[PDB]
Write a protein that holds these residues in place. Sequence first.
Motif, PDB file in Angstrom:
ATOM      1  N   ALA A   8     -21.554 -40.959   0.844  1.00  0.00           N
ATOM      2  CA  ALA A   8     -21.780 -42.182   0.068  1.00  0.00           C
ATOM      3  C   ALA A   8     -20.680 -42.395  -0.980  1.00  0.00           C
ATOM      4  CB  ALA A   8     -23.145 -42.158  -0.600  1.00  0.00           C
ATOM      5  N   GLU A 485     -25.007 -47.218   9.349  1.00  0.00           N
ATOM      6  CA  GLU A 485     -25.380 -47.697   8.009  1.00  0.00           C
ATOM      7  C   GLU A 485     -24.624 -48.915   7.507  1.00  0.00           C
ATOM      8  OE1 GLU A 485     -26.312 -44.218   5.273  1.00  0.00           O
ATOM      9  OE2 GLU A 485     -25.048 -43.341   6.866  1.00  0.00           O
ATOM     10  N   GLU A 486     -23.453 -49.187   8.084  1.00  0.00           N
ATOM     11  CA  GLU A 486     -22.621 -50.321   7.653  1.00  0.00           C
ATOM     12  C   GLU A 486     -22.184 -51.126   8.856  1.00  0.00           C
ATOM     13  OE1 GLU A 486     -19.521 -47.910   5.663  1.00  0.00           O
ATOM     14  OE2 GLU A 486     -20.154 -48.824   3.766  1.00  0.00           O
ATOM     15  N   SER A 507     -21.154 -53.305   3.551  1.00  0.00           N
ATOM     16  CA  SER A 507     -20.670 -52.158   2.791  1.00  0.00           C
ATOM     17  C   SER A 507     -21.737 -51.521   1.924  1.00  0.00           C
ATOM     18  CB  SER A 507     -19.522 -52.581   1.879  1.00  0.00           C
ATOM     19  OG  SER A 507     -18.992 -51.452   1.209  1.00  0.00           O
ATOM     20  N   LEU A 508     -21.651 -50.198   1.796  1.00  0.00           N
ATOM     21  CA  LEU A 508     -22.437 -49.436   0.832  1.00  0.00           C
ATOM     22  C   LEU A 508     -21.991 -49.692  -0.608  1.00  0.00           C
ATOM     23  CD1 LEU A 508     -22.604 -46.001   2.741  1.00  0.00           C
ATOM     24  CD2 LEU A 508     -24.548 -47.547   2.373  1.00  0.00           C
ATOM     25  N   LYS A 510     -21.550 -51.862  -3.582  1.00  0.00           N
ATOM     26  CA  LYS A 510     -22.392 -53.012  -3.927  1.00  0.00           C
ATOM     27  C   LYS A 510     -21.698 -54.149  -4.671  1.00  0.00           C
ATOM     28  CE  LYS A 510     -25.167 -51.781  -1.256  1.00  0.00           C
ATOM     29  NZ  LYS A 510     -24.964 -52.590  -0.017  1.00  0.00           N
ATOM     30  N   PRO A 561     -16.521 -51.865   4.368  1.00  0.00           N
ATOM     31  CA  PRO A 561     -17.343 -50.648   4.515  1.00  0.00           C
ATOM     32  C   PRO A 561     -16.626 -49.412   3.987  1.00  0.00           C
ATOM     33  CG  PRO A 561     -16.441 -51.334   6.646  1.00  0.00           C
ATOM     34  CD  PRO A 561     -16.196 -52.459   5.684  1.00  0.00           C
ATOM     35  N   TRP A 562     -17.382 -48.507   3.375  1.00  0.00           N
ATOM     36  CA  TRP A 562     -16.806 -47.287   2.820  1.00  0.00           C
ATOM     37  C   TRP A 562     -16.587 -46.198   3.872  1.00  0.00           C
ATOM     38  CZ3 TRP A 562     -13.843 -45.328  -0.684  1.00  0.00           C
ATOM     39  CH2 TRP A 562     -13.864 -43.941  -0.960  1.00  0.00           C
ATOM     40  N   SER A 566     -17.228 -46.546  10.095  1.00  0.00           N
ATOM     41  CA  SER A 566     -17.704 -47.928  10.191  1.00  0.00           C
ATOM     42  C   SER A 566     -16.624 -48.825  10.818  1.00  0.00           C
ATOM     43  CB  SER A 566     -18.174 -48.441   8.829  1.00  0.00           C
ATOM     44  OG  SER A 566     -19.196 -47.613   8.316  1.00  0.00           O
TER      45      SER A 566
END
Lengths: 624, 624
Positions: A8, A485-486, A507-508, A510, A561-562, A566
């Motif tokens: 993360a 997740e992304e 993207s994680l 924010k 996206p991080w 992704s």
Amino acid sequence: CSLDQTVAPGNLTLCGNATLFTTFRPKARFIAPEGWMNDPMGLYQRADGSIHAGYQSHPKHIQWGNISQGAAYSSDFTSWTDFNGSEGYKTIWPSQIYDIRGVFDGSIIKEGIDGYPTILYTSTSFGPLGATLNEAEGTETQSLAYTTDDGASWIKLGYGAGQNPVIYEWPETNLTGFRDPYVFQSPRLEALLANTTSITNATGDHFATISGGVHGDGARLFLYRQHTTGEFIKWTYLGPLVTTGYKESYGEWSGNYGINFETAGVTRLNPAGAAWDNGSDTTAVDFVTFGTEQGRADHQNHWPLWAAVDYEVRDNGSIEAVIAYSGVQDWGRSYAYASFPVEGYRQVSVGWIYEDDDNVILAKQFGYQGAFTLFRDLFVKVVENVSPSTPGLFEQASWSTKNSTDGMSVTVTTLGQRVVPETLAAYKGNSTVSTLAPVMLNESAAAYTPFSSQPTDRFYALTGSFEFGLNTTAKAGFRVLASEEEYTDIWFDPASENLTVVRTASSLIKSFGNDTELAKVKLYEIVGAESKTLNLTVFVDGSVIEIYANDEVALSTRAYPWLANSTGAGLLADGTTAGDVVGVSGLELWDGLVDAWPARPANTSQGLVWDGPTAAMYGLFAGY
Amino acid sequence: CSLDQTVAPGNLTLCGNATLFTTFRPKARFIAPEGWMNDPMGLYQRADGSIHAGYQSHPKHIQWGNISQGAAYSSDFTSWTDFNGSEGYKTIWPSQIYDIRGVFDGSIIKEGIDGYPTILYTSTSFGPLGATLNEAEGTETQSLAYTTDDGASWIKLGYGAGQNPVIYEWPETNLTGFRDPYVFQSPRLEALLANTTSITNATGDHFATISGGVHGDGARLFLYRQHTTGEFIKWTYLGPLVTTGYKESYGEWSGNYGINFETAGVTRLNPAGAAWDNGSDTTAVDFVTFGTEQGRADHQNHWPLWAAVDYEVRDNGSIEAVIAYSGVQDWGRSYAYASFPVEGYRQVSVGWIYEDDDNVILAKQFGYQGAFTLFRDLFVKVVENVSPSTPGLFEQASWSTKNSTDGMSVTVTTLGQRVVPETLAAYKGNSTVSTLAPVMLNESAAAYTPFSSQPTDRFYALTGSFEFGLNTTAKAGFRVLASEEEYTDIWFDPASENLTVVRTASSLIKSFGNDTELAKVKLYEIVGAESKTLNLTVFVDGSVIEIYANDEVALSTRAYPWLANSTGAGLLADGTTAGDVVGVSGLELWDGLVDAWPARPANTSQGLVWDGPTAAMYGLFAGY
Ligand SMILES: *[C@@H]1O[C@H](CO)[C@@H](O[C@@H]2O[C@H](CO)[C@@H](O[C@@H]3O[C@H](CO[C@H]4O[C@H](CO[C@H]5O[C@H](CO)[C@@H](O)[C@H](O)[C@@H]5O[C@H]5O[C@H](CO)[C@@H](O)[C@H](O)[C@@H]5O)[C@@H](O)[C@H](O[C@H]5O[C@H](CO)[C@@H](O)[C@H](O)[C@@H]5O)[C@@H]4O)[C@@H](O)[C@H](O[C@H]4O[C@H](CO)[C@@H](O)[C@H](O)[C@@H]4O[C@H]4O[C@H](CO)[C@@H](O)[C@H](O)[C@@H]4O[C@H]4O[C@H](CO)[C@@H](O)[C@H](O)[C@@H]4O)[C@@H]3O)[C@H](O)[C@H]2NC(C)=O)[C@H](O)[C@H]1NC(C)=O
Ligand SMILES: *[C@@H]1O[C@H](CO)[C@@H](O[C@@H]2O[C@H](CO)[C@@H](O[C@@H]3O[C@H](CO[C@H]4O[C@H](CO[C@H]5O[C@H](CO)[C@@H](O)[C@H](O)[C@@H]5O[C@H]5O[C@H](CO)[C@@H](O)[C@H](O)[C@@H]5O)[C@@H](O)[C@H](O[C@H]5O[C@H](CO)[C@@H](O)[C@H](O)[C@@H]5O)[C@@H]4O)[C@@H](O)[C@H](O[C@H]4O[C@H](CO)[C@@H](O)[C@H](O)[C@@H]4O[C@H]4O[C@H](CO)[C@@H](O)[C@H](O)[C@@H]4O[C@H]4O[C@H](CO)[C@@H](O)[C@H](O)[C@@H]4O)[C@@H]3O)[C@H](O)[C@H]2NC(C)=O)[C@H](O)[C@H]1NC(C)=O
Ligand SMILES: *[C@@H]1O[C@H](CO)[C@@H](O[C@@H]2O[C@H](CO)[C@@H](O[C@@H]3O[C@H](CO[C@H]4O[C@H](CO)[C@@H](O)[C@H](O[C@H]5O[C@H](CO)[C@@H](O)[C@H](O)[C@@H]5O)[C@@H]4O)[C@@H](O)[C@H](O[C@H]4O[C@H](CO)[C@@H](O)[C@H](O)[C@@H]4O)[C@@H]3O)[C@H](O)[C@H]2NC(C)=O)[C@H](O)[C@H]1NC(C)=O
Ligand SMILES: *[C@@H]1O[C@H](CO)[C@@H](O[C@@H]2O[C@H](CO)[C@@H](O[C@@H]3O[C@H](CO[C@H]4O[C@H](CO)[C@@H](O)[C@H](O[C@H]5O[C@H](CO)[C@@H](O)[C@H](O)[C@@H]5O)[C@@H]4O)[C@@H](O)[C@H](O[C@H]4O[C@H](CO)[C@@H](O)[C@H](O)[C@@H]4O)[C@@H]3O)[C@H](O)[C@H]2NC(C)=O)[C@H](O)[C@H]1NC(C)=O
Ligand SMILES: *[C@@H]1O[C@H](CO)[C@@H](O[C@@H]2O[C@H](CO)[C@@H](O)[C@H](O)[C@H]2NC(C)=O)[C@H](O)[C@H]1NC(C)=O
Ligand SMILES: *[C@@H]1O[C@H](CO)[C@@H](O)[C@H](O)[C@H]1NC(C)=O
Ligand SMILES: *[C@@H]1O[C@H](CO)[C@@H](O)[C@H](O)[C@H]1NC(C)=O
Ligand SMILES: *[C@@H]1O[C@H](CO)[C@@H](O)[C@H](O)[C@H]1NC(C)=O
Ligand SMILES: *[C@@H]1O[C@H](CO)[C@@H](O)[C@H](O)[C@H]1NC(C)=O
Ligand SMILES: *[C@@H]1O[C@H](CO)[C@@H](O)[C@H](O)[C@H]1NC(C)=O
Ligand SMILES: *[C@@H]1O[C@H](CO)[C@@H](O)[C@H](O)[C@H]1NC(C)=O
Ligand SMILES: *[C@@H]1O[C@H](CO)[C@@H](O)[C@H](O)[C@H]1NC(C)=O
Ligand SMILES: *[C@@H]1O[C@H](CO)[C@@H](O)[C@H](O)[C@H]1NC(C)=O
Ligand SMILES: *[C@@H]1O[C@H](CO)[C@@H](O)[C@H](O)[C@H]1NC(C)=O
Ligand SMILES: *[C@@H]1O[C@H](CO)[C@@H](O)[C@H](O)[C@H]1NC(C)=O
Ligand SMILES: *[C@@H]1O[C@H](CO)[C@@H](O)[C@H](O)[C@H]1NC(C)=O
Ligand SMILES: *[C@@H]1O[C@H](CO)[C@@H](O)[C@H](O)[C@H]1NC(C)=O
Ligand SMILES: *[C@@H]1O[C@H](CO)[C@@H](O)[C@H](O)[C@H]1NC(C)=O
Ligand SMILES: *[C@@H]1O[C@H](CO)[C@@H](O)[C@H](O)[C@H]1NC(C)=O
Ligand SMILES: *[C@@H]1O[C@H](CO)[C@@H](O)[C@H](O)[C@H]1NC(C)=O
Ligand SMILES: *[C@@H]1O[C@H](CO)[C@@H](O)[C@H](O)[C@H]1NC(C)=O
């Protein structure tokens, strides 16, 4: 600050300057070496056939300021080389009382001062400058410079009477703006005005528009004509070319005309590309392109628009361009489209894609802001044998219709846009290409189906033909930049005519924008067809997602996206059933694209600087 | 337009640009090649011993604007050579947001950035600028540039935090001005502050004053100290060095302190010239020189002043310069005296002589405006064995008195000024010199007596010693630039202590100034003497009349006679009788002087230009 993209994201605001330089950075397109960029400017094809591209530039900063022309060149629109002179990659910069506040957009007179390529640009000085402010005459003027070394350097004319600036008087009172001169030749306009040249004495072979508007009364595009051929000081104001109302909208397919024009251009096109006839070509259409401001709630209050126009000659020897129909040149986070003539009867357009970090949260960590769109051939898109039962066809909002003699079929005419073929060829030939089997999206389709071959990084192109039933309520599209997740979802919904880009999961991180992008797309139904087809092409380039539909609709956006993984892509399906099937064919992945800047190392940051306490004292630039 | 100088002048306003270029032009002094000039600036003795002189310059205009440093050099203060580079004779010009409004006065750090000579100058930007206006912080800042080629060119430090401008914050609120930095070394000030360096942390070997004042509350000279030796970015504000009241006057001998200081300097002198001791030399005196504005009804509201000061150390580690006595550095049409150190313990001062055409009636016809004064050695003038019965002696207005032990004699101390000896030697040796017989002015004296030898043109010097009775009511002096119809009368009137220049007949051309000039001169009477003596030296140079009395009093003015033969000179006498006789001796005429610019042709005009309509739009410069 950790740069571990397998976990993360931390608090990335603690990261140093340009520590995120390569993380989200486009590799396959035009972009400054570092720092701030916006609008394309000074575009022209040089004598050797290569392309000169300038851009609004502020090196070593991540906000606009001291705005300058940065420059590069290319033989194929695709692989670029920076100029390198005394000011690095800059070739024009604030240097005189008349332009010290910024060297704003300008355009090229190919055969100008002493036969040299010559830029007419907005030279800005002190004072309130803006459509919502109380601007005064002199703050924005128009000035000339010419190049004797093919754009490596420019020589400005002297300051003074009969020299720079060459245009300084406001043509009307209480302007909201007075900038972005667009210089062009027009056999069409010359033919139209030939009977009235006694009224104005203006007989030159160059015209220039200047973009603006009038306080409380809408936008204006002002038309000037060079006063004598071979002479570049005297430009005669004819009249307003385009006049629109205060926040006037032509409708759902046409954005909003806002309060002020920026970056307007004038062209003439036919089905093949650029048209240089005097009006004699019946297949040719006159077009204006223009940015509008303060008529949008989001997208930095900005619409990049176009309109097909019919010219009328006024009694005072000027031209009224009457809007016939009006569309959108890109539906997403792009603006300031400039177009220019290219050999072989072409008109090539390119714009600026801004970031989606409006609160300036990770800009310093990037160490840069902005990129270009891809370069696009403009042409008149003609769709033949259109079914009269196409929903909303006779609204004629951003297209024209012409009935067949028997009234059983329709010819549709609109503005076409396609990526220049040099870029497509270079992208394809340098990529690992996977030609994918056709897929029927039915009752067995998952929401997301990854492609049988997958991208290897954030630099790829996708294409597909989506065949829908005439009364479908199904949605289909492409998911890109995807891990568990992304991901970023590109949907088309024929029932609503809406193309959306859903970014709730992009993207994680924010702080980046996550609002849904929207384009309208008209699927012109063909006589005898029992289906309707969307041709979707998607370019993924670092953080840029650039979408093309049907050589007509463009939408540029951003996803950051991080996670390192992704990068995936595949098909999207919603409400596909045994009865309501979406046929997907012509599927192809291009993995890798082209390294657009082969001479540049991966990290071209030169650090960031602060203007110091005087920035707030002068009040002109943010200072960073 | 006729240029016939054997008949009455016509309407000279009908004459073309620079048609009157040579007519009234000084030949024997420092002057720009053409166009507008004002204040001397950037003065220093270069490593090869030659003198660098800069000046506020606006080429091809006859009003102030785009103010730049013009430059030249000399081995002897007298014969000069222009620099010639990419910008002609300019070496610094507006080029950056921080100085685009004008490169105002600056002074030299001899061993500055990387060991090179370095100018600290006022960099001006946009906004109201003036003592009577509502100026804001940032409009006037202070910036650095250095030269690697002995003044042929200057390199400015970059714009930004920790770079240019180096001084930008106002040290106090509501300033009337913030300009003309004067950089200097001072063993005296270093010695005084050595005990307080813990309070401020400022320990550098350079000090700088900045000239200004506070709205409604009088003028201020602000003191800064270089913060660390060998480092030039950080300058620490200590406190106000000189504080005077709103239009405060020290008296009849001292002009008026006005509302705002301009061009202030700080020096330390002894009887021989410059003094570089820490306070240990009992014969040395600390002096401040300064221009004041808006405390004079005429002379463009301007006084060039000086004051002897005694320094006090404040508790906060700053210096108060307490005025001990206060005088005038030139009583006429001159301003903006700059001084600089010269080898052999010298302090050399030079100012700007403006024209006397305030309504700008023949400026365009001139094609230039302005010249320098002569270069003047500064020193402590000491008069010994002064009679206590000298009228008004103990007022001590612009001099100091010290009694002998027995109280029978007085030592007078004041600021001395004399033309540099290199100029006097060169002038004399290049002239036709006529040594004239002594003349007694008595009952038989005409009002005007021409000298037995006469000048041949408008370039000459006169000297004379005028011996007056202690209770005289007679007046005597020199008439210069004289024919039957045009002449300029220089009178001294011991009874009133007034030296006047009467200009009612100076020229047939009526548009030039004709008001009477006035200086006060104290004839210090010597113990045992039965007379009092005025030593008068007059320089005539085109239109400049520059008067020196007693190595103390200076008065610069202008006369523009039209007639070719208005070049004569001789003695003036009024109320001389058999009983009241004026003895005139040491009489000498120097005809011709020196051609100060041997490489220049007679006409160095390059024409005049107009800025065009944008000049009024920007509102910064007249435009012509
Ligand atoms: C405040 O003050 C400011 C400072 O003075 C002022 O700005 C200055 O304004 C002046 C006046 O407008 C400008 O002067 C013009 O300059 C043009 C060229 O500009 C380029 O080149 C100069 C000089 O370049 C040398 O020096 C630099 C610096 O060292 C070097 O880097 C170069 O390599 C080059 O060096 C060589 O030469 C040196 C000697 O000069 C040698 O020392 C050296 O060894 C080398 O060999 C640069 O400084 C300029 O840079 C600046 O500007 C650019 C933008 O342009 C910036 O990006 C940059 O940062 C700098 O700021 C620049 O690169 C000249 O072309 C121009 O002369 C023409 O116009 C005038 C009239 O305006 C005529 O009198 C003159 O005759 C010329 O016209 C003829 O020629 C042209 C083209 O050839 C024709 O189009 C024209 O019709 C005419 O033709 C005639 O001749 C023909 C041929 O024979 C004939 O056929 C025809 O019939 C006809 O008769 C002019 O001199 C000056 O550049 C500004 N400087 C700066 C620093 O800004 C500012 O405006 C003031 N502000 C206000 C409010 O007043
Ligand atoms: C808006 O945009 C504007 C445009 O970008 C911007 O203005 C520009 O700002 C920048 C940034 O401040 C300025 O860049 C500085 O330039 C200084 C030199 O300036 C002089 O020279 C340049 C270049 O000269 C070449 O080109 C011209 C033009 O063609 C020619 O005429 C020359 O002859 C010369 O040509 C040769 O070289 C070319 C390649 O460069 C070749 O093409 C050519 O063939 C020739 O061989 C000129 O352009 C300048 O002219 C302009 O400015 C003058 C006033 O100065 C005007 O009168 C004129 O009209 C023009 O406007 C000028 O003459 C550099 O010295 C400086 O670099 C130092 O500083 C930076 C930090 O700021 C450091 O990163 C850098 O390392 C340098 O510092 C080191 O060196 C110095 C001195 O040696 C040391 O003091 C220092 O401590 C440090 O030492 C280090 O190295 C040591 C040695 O190894 C070591 O021992 C130490 O330990 C240490 O590490 C900097 O690059 C730029 O000049 C401005 N340009 C213009 C046109 O204005 C503007 O600010 C912007 N505004 C806003 C609001 O943002
Ligand atoms: C001699 O030197 C001067 C420089 O001082 C040279 O330039 C001239 O300067 C004067 C100012 O000294 C200018 O006068 C002003 O003119 C405007 C109106 O100008 C218009 O009409 C002119 C007359 O026919 C015409 O020549 C002008 O054309 C020039 O400028 C335009 C841009 O406007 C440009 O496109 C052209 O190419 C020319 O360059 C122009 O159309 C006037 O409004 C001014 O009035 C103000 O000033 C006075 C005092 O305040 C006052 O009476 C008014 O109330 C007002 O406030 C002012 O008179 C003149 O225009 C300049 N001429 C030029 C540039 O050609 C001049 O050329 C030199 N002569 C020679 C032979 O070299
Ligand atoms: C990374 O990149 C940045 C460029 O973006 C480099 O420079 C720094 O930029 C930021 C802005 O991005 C500056 O922040 C501002 O700082 C001032 C206060 O600054 C003072 O205190 C600092 C902290 O100790 C100190 O470093 C500063 O010293 C520099 O400047 C002085 C002149 O003031 C100069 O003399 C020195 O030599 C230094 O150059 C200074 O004393 C602050 O007021 C600002 O606040 C505003 O901004 C935000 C947003 O609006 C807000 O919170 C406030 O309300 C207010 O409006 C702002 O924070 C920073 O000072 C710059 N640092 C410098 C120049 O050293 C940075 O150096 C790059 N890093 C690296 C490692 O290269
Ligand atoms: C006026 O000038 C004369 C001539 O220079 C001065 O007289 C000289 O004074 C010095 C002393 O400082 C003597 O060394 C000379 O012998 C004097 N020369 C003479 C008398 O010819 C005189 O002091 C000056 N007067 C004033 C008032 O300044
Ligand atoms: C992230 O760090 C910043 C400092 O850059 C701080 O202001 C912010 O509160 C941090 N966020 C957290 C701890 O969630
Ligand atoms: C890129 O280069 C800049 C400037 O040297 C440096 O500050 C930054 O840390 C670098 N970033 C990366 C990701 O390498
Ligand atoms: C010509 O007419 C149009 C429409 O009335 C007007 O807007 C424009 O200003 C006129 N052009 C001039 C006066 O040059
Ligand atoms: C790869 O890209 C380059 C640069 O655009 C291009 O010239 C070349 O033809 C491409 N290679 C192919 C298509 O094989
Ligand atoms: C439905 O979709 C799947 C996957 O494309 C395919 O195998 C199947 O044949 C389709 N069904 C029909 C009836 O065509
Ligand atoms: C990708 O990376 C994430 C985080 O490291 C991991 O949880 C996941 O298993 C990987 N693959 C995906 C999401 O397809
Ligand atoms: C389609 O877009 C329009 C805006 O053009 C919007 O009002 C409408 O709700 C959208 N419909 C759907 C189903 O997304
Ligand atoms: C999108 O960003 C906004 C910040 O305006 C935030 O409130 C929201 O949670 C974000 N959406 C997500 C995480 O899906
Ligand atoms: C002199 O000529 C000017 C024009 O420059 C004119 O205004 C003035 O009236 C003339 N003076 C006379 C005739 O006395
Ligand atoms: C001096 O030179 C200028 C510029 O060439 C010219 O206009 C003017 O008439 C000349 N004047 C004289 C008196 O020669
Ligand atoms: C030091 O004291 C003087 C006199 O009170 C004051 O004017 C000056 O501003 C002070 N200096 C500072 C605060 O640096
Ligand atoms: C004449 O003047 C020059 C220049 O100042 C000077 O060097 C020279 O010595 C003078 N000639 C003399 C005094 O004979
Ligand atoms: C008075 O002056 C004249 C001229 O200088 C002279 O000849 C005469 O001798 C003087 N008279 C006396 C009494 O000295
Ligand atoms: C000087 O010139 C004027 C005008 O030409 C003439 O009247 C006179 O006789 C001449 N000599 C003088 C005034 O000494
Ligand atoms: C002398 O000058 C003063 C001004 O300093 C003036 O008031 C006085 O009238 C003058 N006296 C004479 C006789 O000129
Ligand atoms: C001096 O100039 C003024 C103009 O202010 C004028 O009234 C007066 O007549 C002139 N004096 C003369 C001619 O003696």
